[PDB]
């Protein structure tokens, strides 16, 4: 029973082709959804009531459009998400942390616009996890971007949106001083011909996937939910070709915005990347993650990398990981195994950080400290494996692999664990 | 000799790349494609598009199969449509540059128990009036391809059946369905009902590979381009969509409302035809020449051997062309199955072979009406020259190119055992 | 280039020029061979035990150690020849040879004592020289037996009785030597702890133009399932007369290698002839020219592929820790083992470092040289009050005799195989180290 | 059938992983195929004997070796003219007559840095009695294979150059010295006392390598079956390296003292025949076919994208020969550098081709003799069928086989660009 579920059959294909031949629609998927979703915050979504709803549906990320509306517009939006998301902090083994990403306005006819200097000073004032930086062109945009967060919002991640020619040429240089990269397909549709925009989306994504940063897929991807209960052919095949193409995560803007169907977009959106991901050929993608990934003498990297071949190999339920900032988490994340990354943590901001990273399941720490460290770690760890077999994640039996550091403080992870559970 | 310029078109360095993860890495939205547009386009035929005059634009737009969708519209209806179809395709019969043949395919109005009284009277209707293809609707048994191809009565047997997957059965029992039919629609209209909405990629992905592995023609189709019945433009989902049908290895690409009913039939041929040549360029034929060929049994068909061998001489020299001699279409088929990058230009007599070849990727028909040779070799000449001039015309060929030409040892069908390396003088 | 180019400034152009590291980085197996340098050195300790065969030519204590210094792991009896007491005075002068450097435990080298038997002759059980020449292995505390002729899996029973409830301990190496034995190969090994292609006996058995085929066979068979198997007979032949073998033999010993033998053989070369320590010096430095030319890229995917899915935390770990290895180019990893199966579970994935196997079992420190890669080391020492403090000093003490040995360096990464609880069968544990 | 697939190792051929193919190699499981390795056996006192070199043909020697070492002008010359005669006594069955070439193994620089007096008397002497091939001795650089070759003279333009790589310089400057060359030999001997014993295997192995990388010919020598100078048997390790030889890549592998003076000259060319059809069987064609491939360069030459889709058309079908029409040898080569499992079976009228090709793994020479038939196409199937029926004699064919046949589209040397599927009959 075990091997007909979750596209079992189709995963142990010898050759791609042979892959496709066996997938089956009656092959359920058994893992959680590993793709994020954000949701694009607006009148239709708005209220506390409304956001509890999206946030039982599968919203991982809220993104506030800064493109309209003011401030004040903005702060209750901040206000009522946050409202929603400590509605159910009640069970801490079950909450589910939701990040905020301020989308700035862009450049215009302009370097960094004077709105964007005072909307990113907003998003520091007012705690945003991440900033989606509109019309990014070259390095120096990005500069400017992390310049204005100035030295308190230090953490704050942020996802250079490519949405021109320039961006697309300028990929690399851009990539390499952003957290991540979104694929702002509406206006690289309009900039680039229309035919053109899947090979930057596959490009893009592939090199993220390749650097091992995150990537996120958007726009129009169940556009005709705004007004129909039901998206079209086309737009599921495009939410599932993204999680296959390996985007990190998926967005709704005006089919959450100002649809009439907001929250069954989410679930729409849950549905599809859960059945993607149990269609992802994981033999060829770790092997060529892992070919392409270059050798390291930092033992985070090293760690990872034995991590998560042990959970290939022990068909394991899931990497419990203990992280201060995410790092560990998203370097087991780019080997894109398919045992869940639990991310056990005490920062709020790095459990909602990580959702930007495919396969990352975090967990909230808040339980008190144990007086050895030693026993904190394991605490902590027995949480994870705790929130695992409650969420339906772990089962009596199962082998986990347990990533943790010799020394307190970030940046010391050096140590991976075969654990039975119960 | 071919110069740093043509390693910079058709996404040539994204296929000398060594992983599939690298291939991606190296698409370029700068590498413009070079080749001819290889999926062939199936646009519906309705009120938006039935005019002679509509119906030459949507021809030099792209369009290579007309669908006539029996759901609607009487035999009197459906017959002034062909009539339409076969006047505008003839009007360009006098320019060989524009001239290219359009096969007609009776899209069935569907089964009740058996195959349904109306169903046996369009296909009778589909018999008299020369219709090229079937796509038969709610397949869902091996039988149900029998008693189409039973209707198609003592006159049909030629007429090739595209069995439409529409529900949890046909895909069930997918595999005895394909064996009995020439090929696959995946109808997702229906399958989206039929079935959860977030599985039909699934079915979609699962059809194409067995279809890919069969050697037989698949058809993508509903709501690729669905915004584009109102709008100019269509969405970055329907984009995405066809480009994703053309890399998941379907053969035709469908239009059902986007040419029958809406506002901008032409533009959406221009558009599938567009993301086509696009998504053709960027597939990574390294991994999927290898796999094809794994895949494959051994065979002892002197038809089958050639066309593996054609196709890797090919890849070898980055032929612009495969000139094939056919009679019933097969030999370009087989040629076809391994995915050459090489454009197949079939030389027929047949007009009906020249018509259903669209069907399968890559095909390019070309009908040769010339008197036979008295010496065969000669007769056989003339249609490779005919071939290779042809080519020259329409941008495949030009002077010092390489083509790889395949014949048979004697005339008839199913004698295909030759491949020659010729060089274009 | 972009796989290794921070690697390569950090470790320097130089690093990547030696041990074939250019062949190893090739894409292809034809790209690999093309690549294959005799100008780059082999810097890795060998890897790939010596068996040396003792008799009149090696069997004085002074002699002995030379051929300890030289390389032997493995002393072997062959009990077809000699009575009871020559053999026991040969395993008293190997021991007393052996023990002759245990002054210094950071770098003393166990060496494993295996018993040859006669065979079954013309008969079709155990002969009853075996089972005396058994019981007498079992009486002098033989590592391994060398069963000859094993044809079928109530073979190994028959020589496993015969050793008694005493020797439950001693490994069994199964002699593959004719017809049977190799058809009823899956068998045989199923119930052994590991095989020898016995090719002189073998050669005369099947046809010569044959024997390859079984030799590529049971090894590839061993290898995955992850067994030791021993390649002999006629190695380096020539060398019983001559100071330097011919160009057929050096090719033999290589081919060996590279074939994925975990150990290779001297039978008349050291037991009789002229040149026994420049034969063990020769095997020594074919074997660690050959391991550098194995090609791990696609070896260790092959093992992967291969190998079934597996619920043994020791075997999760095992792999967990060799994927580390190859990641960081570490120089060792360091494993606890009591009975030497953690060290064969790291050993069956080929590692290119090397595997420092820290035991307090003097057995278990000679019967892992059966293991490619496995480099024993004896510790003395009584245990801590803490179990965790024991565990730290153990893997402290291979850190130090690593780095007294030339197997670790400052700067170096190393790969550290421990468990969560005292005694066998508990390894779950990987650690990435900095040494200091 | 069955039976078919249980012998020449069909079980491992099909294995997924080399690992595999390992494991599932059978000591029953017999060689079917015709032994492709050439064997080069060096004449001397033990060799010289008409009748005994009558039986060292029919055991399997390919290539009669004159150690220009030893010897005088005169006693070579005597060497020749005993090959010639017990070549020519089988010439009165043309169907199985076999060609056996004769090379010239030079005594070498000695002391000296360029080419040495004896050398080029030596060499004078091997044109004037048409010797097929030369063993060039301790080959440093590209200017000792030029200066070779200016020795050979106007008259011995067609005489093949194989480089002896004996020393760290000729390893070190090996690419340069392989350009130039025809093929190499790795002259283990003199490199074992030049270099480190123990690093003799990775010069062998890489020099192998390289060689099947440029399709040139690589011959393994010294010391194979040493012990058969005076035993009737080898050693362990002697069949191990003759086996390891062709599994690395060799092409041809020799024999020296066991030919030249040992007691079992025959026993020993039986010997290398008997391990070589073995080892051949035991070659993993899957992943050797697919890197051969990747690593060719693209090429424009017809011949070149002729013999790599002949090839893939071969394995598809099984074929059991690929028949090829040659004027020079060339068309074989590169069939050969393919490493087909398929016999490449020649046709030629050139007798000097015909013996030089057996330095290509898997080419087995035939020497049309029947002057030119009238009309060429009749010329060409003449040869064909003379191809067939010298196989169906030899056992390489019978009815119900498939063979693919490579010819050219003209007369002479450089035009092959044809491959036909044919049917035994
Ligand atoms: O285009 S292919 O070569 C192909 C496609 C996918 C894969 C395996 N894959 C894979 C490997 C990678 O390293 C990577 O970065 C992304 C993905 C990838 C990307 C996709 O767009 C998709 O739809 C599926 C995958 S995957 O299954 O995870 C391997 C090969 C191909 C496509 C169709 C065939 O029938 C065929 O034989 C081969
Ligand atoms: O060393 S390996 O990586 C290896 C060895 C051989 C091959 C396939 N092969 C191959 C491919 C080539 O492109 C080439 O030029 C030479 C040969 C080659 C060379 C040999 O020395 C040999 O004994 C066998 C082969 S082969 O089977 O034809 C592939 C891989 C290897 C060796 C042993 C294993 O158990 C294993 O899993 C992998
Ligand atoms: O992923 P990060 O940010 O590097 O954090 C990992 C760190 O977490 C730990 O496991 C636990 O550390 P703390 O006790 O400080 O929470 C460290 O040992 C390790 O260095
Ligand atoms: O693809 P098909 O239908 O088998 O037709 C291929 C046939 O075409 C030819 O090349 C030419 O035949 P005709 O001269 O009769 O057209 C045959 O030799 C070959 O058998
Ligand atoms: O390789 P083996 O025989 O399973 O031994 C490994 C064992 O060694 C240890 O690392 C140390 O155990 P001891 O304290 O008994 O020496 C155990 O935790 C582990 O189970
Ligand atoms: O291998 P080579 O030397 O290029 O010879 C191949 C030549 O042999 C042929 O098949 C037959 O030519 P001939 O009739 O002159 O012998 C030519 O068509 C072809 O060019
Ligand atoms: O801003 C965006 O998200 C876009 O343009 O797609
Ligand atoms: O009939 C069709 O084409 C469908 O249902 O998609
Ligand atoms: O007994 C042996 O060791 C043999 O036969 O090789
Ligand atoms: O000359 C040779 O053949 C050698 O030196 O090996
Ligand atoms: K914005
Ligand atoms: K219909
Ligand atoms: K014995
Ligand atoms: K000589
Ligand atoms: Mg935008
Ligand atoms: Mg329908
Ligand atoms: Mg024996
Ligand atoms: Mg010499």
Redesign the interface.
């Known amino acids: 029973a075990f091997f007909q579920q979750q596209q079992l059959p189709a995963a142990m294909a010898?050759?791609?082709?042979?892959?496709?031949?066996?997938?089956?629609?009656?092959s359920e998927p058994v893992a959680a959804r590993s793709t994020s979703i954000i949701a694009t915050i607006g009148p239709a979504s708005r209220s506390v009531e409304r956001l509890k709803e999206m946030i039982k549906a599968g919203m991982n990320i809220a993104r506030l459009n800064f493109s309209h509306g003011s401030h004040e517009y903005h702060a209750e939006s901040i206000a009522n998400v946050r409202e929603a998301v400590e509605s159910f902090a009640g069970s801490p083994l079950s909450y589910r942390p939701v990040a905020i990403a301020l989308d700035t306005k862009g450049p215009g006819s302009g370097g960094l616009s004077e709105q964007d200097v005072r909307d990113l000073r907003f998003g520091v004032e007012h705690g945003v996890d991440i900033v989606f930086a509109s019309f990014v062109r070259k390095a120096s945009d990005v500069a400017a971007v992390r310049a204005a967060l100035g030295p308190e919002g230090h953490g704050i991640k942020i996802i250079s949106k490519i949405e021109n020619?320039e961006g697309?040429?300028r990929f690399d240089e851009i990539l390499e001083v952003s957290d991540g990269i979104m694929v702002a397909?509406?206006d690289l549709?309009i900039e680039?011909?229309?035919?053109?925009?899947?090979?930057?989306?596959?490009?893009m994504?592939?090199?993220c996937?390749?650097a091992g940063k995150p990537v996120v897929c958007a726009?129009?991807?169940?556009?005709?939910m705004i007004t129909k209960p039901?998206?079209?052919?086309?737009?599921?095949?495009?939410?599932?070709?993204?999680v296959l193409?390996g985007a990190d995560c998926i967005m709704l803007s005006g089919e959450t915005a100002k649809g009439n169907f907001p929250v069954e977009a989410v679930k729409?959106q849950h549905?599809?990347a859960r059945?993607?991901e149990a269609?992802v050929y994981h033999r060829?993608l770790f092997?060529?993650?892992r070919?392409?990934?270059?050798?390291?003498?930092d033992?985070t990297?090293?760690?990872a990398?034995?991590?998560v071949?042990?959970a290939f190999?022990?068909?394991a339920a899931a990497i419990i990981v203990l992280t201060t900032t995410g790092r560990s988490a998203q370097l087991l994340s780019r080997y894109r195994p398919r045992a869940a990354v639990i991310a056990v943590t005490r920062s709020a901001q790095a459990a909602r950080q990580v959702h930007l990273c495919r396969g990352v399941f975090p967990l909230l720490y808040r339980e008190p400290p144990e007086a050895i460290w030693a026993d904190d770690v394991d605490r902590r760890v027995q949480f994870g494996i705790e929130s695992g077999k409650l969420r339906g994640f772990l089962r009596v039996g199962d082998?986990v692999?347990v990533v943790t550091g010799?020394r307190p403080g970030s940046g010391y992870t050096?140590?991976?664990?075969?654990?039975?559970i119960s």
């Open positions: 010898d050759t791609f082709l042979e892959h496709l031949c066996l997938l089956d629609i009656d020619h697309v040429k397909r509406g549709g680039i011909p229309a035919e053109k925009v899947f090979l930057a989306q596959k490009m994504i592939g090199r996937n390749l726009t129009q991807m169940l556009e005709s039901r998206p079209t052919r086309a737009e599921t095949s495009d939410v599932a070709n993204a193409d729409m549905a599809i059945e993607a269609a060829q092997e060529e993650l070919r392409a990934a270059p050798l390291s003498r033992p990297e090293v760690t990398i034995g991590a071949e042990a190999k022990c068909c082998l692999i010799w050096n140590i991976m664990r075969v654990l039975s």
